[PDB]
Ligand binder design. Structure first.
Ligand SMILES: O=C1COc2ccc(C(=O)N3CCC(c4c[nH]c5ccc(Cl)cc45)CC3)cc2N1
Length: 295
């Protein structure tokens, strides 16, 4: 008699049967999270995390949105957090977009007729832009927290050179240095939390993955005249990871009739984990923006 193989486990050895999950088109398990209100939801909202991090970092944002009677949902992108895949490897950046769309489609089956929003930070914001550009008119709105539109010009220059070197010869292990955690936030407690989280990949950026981030930037640029979705864009003026010039470019080039930019003067990259005055404002502004578009 043949026997069923041992239960499939996360990279942290937890059986997927014990966790909310979804199997993507490549047969990879994605770890999922849900925050549903007690009443009928007014809308759905997908939360899209950034490079090297995971969905558990959105707990407070998600609880605030759930408090507005939205059903919030997320997954860890392939190669991140509790989802499968070699760490911070992706065959093509579109895999992330495809997988968001599968999860959105699956949720809309369970909750039909509801509007759906996207919320993305950093690389997750590039994923949100490309997801909304692929399906014009499908999403009710998008919240972008320091989305990856333009990288830091120096990091882009250094990676375009490494991409050229790696694309010319066979160097599968070539990597750049790790992200300088001090530039994430002026809030030192949040920098220390980032450095203490075992689900965050703090290894050097692999050149293969950097090439996919360069692809995301190029694809976002081409997508902007196709972007019509309403959006709120939040950006720190002293962001060394996603250049503020990209936020101004998005405001100028997107076709969206409903587009708003808020600049946080002196703030670093992770606006939802910045100094309290900034973080409280970010949560309040997202609350107001979504409340106005779900009422
Ligand atoms: O809360 C947190 C924790 O720490 C993060 C690290 C990276 C990011 C993120 O998604 N990034 C996008 C990629 C960017 C980057 C670093 N080197 C590059 C070379 C080329 C290109 Cl196109 C982009 C890059 C860093 C920020 C989010 C966060 N947010």
């Amino acid at each position: 008699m043949p026997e069923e193989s041992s239960p499939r486990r996360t990279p942290q050895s937890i059986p997927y049967q014990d966790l909310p999950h979804l199997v993507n088109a490549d047969g990879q398990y994605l770890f999922c999270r849900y925050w549903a209100p007690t009443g009928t939801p007014k809308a759905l909202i997908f939360v899209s995390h950034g490079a090297g991090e995971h969905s558990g970092r959105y707990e407070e944002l998600a609880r605030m949105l759930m408090g507005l009677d939205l059903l919030v949902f997320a997954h860890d992108h392939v190669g991140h957090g509790q989802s499968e895949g070699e760490r911070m490897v992706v065959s093509d950046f579109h895999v992330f977009v495809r997988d968001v769309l599968q999860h959105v489609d699956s949720m809309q089956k369970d909750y039909p007729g509801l509007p759906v929003f996207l919320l993305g930070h950093s690389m997750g914001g590039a994923i949100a832009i490309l997801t909304a550009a692929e399906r014009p008119g499908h999403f009710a709105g998008m919240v972008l927290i320091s989305p990856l539109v333009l990288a830091n010009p120096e990091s882009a220059t250094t990676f375009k050179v490494l991409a050229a070197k790696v694309l010319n010869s066979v160097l599968p292990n070539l990597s750049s240095g790790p992200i300088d955690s001090s530039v994430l936030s002026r809030n030192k407690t949040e920098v220390d939390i980032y450095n203490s989280d075992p689900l965050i990949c703090r290894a050097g950026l692999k050149v293969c993955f950097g090439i996919q981030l360069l692809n995301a930037v190029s694809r976002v640029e081409r997508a902007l005249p196709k972007l019509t979705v309403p959006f709120l864009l939040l950006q720190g003026s002293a962001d060394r990871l996603c250049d503020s010039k990209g936020a101004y470019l998005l405001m100028e080039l997107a076709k969206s009739q409903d587009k708003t930019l808020k600049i946080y003067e002196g703030a670093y990259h992770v606006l939802h984990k910045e100094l309290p005055e900034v973080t409280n404002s970010v949560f309040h502004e997202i609350n107001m923006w979504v409340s106005q578009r779900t009422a």
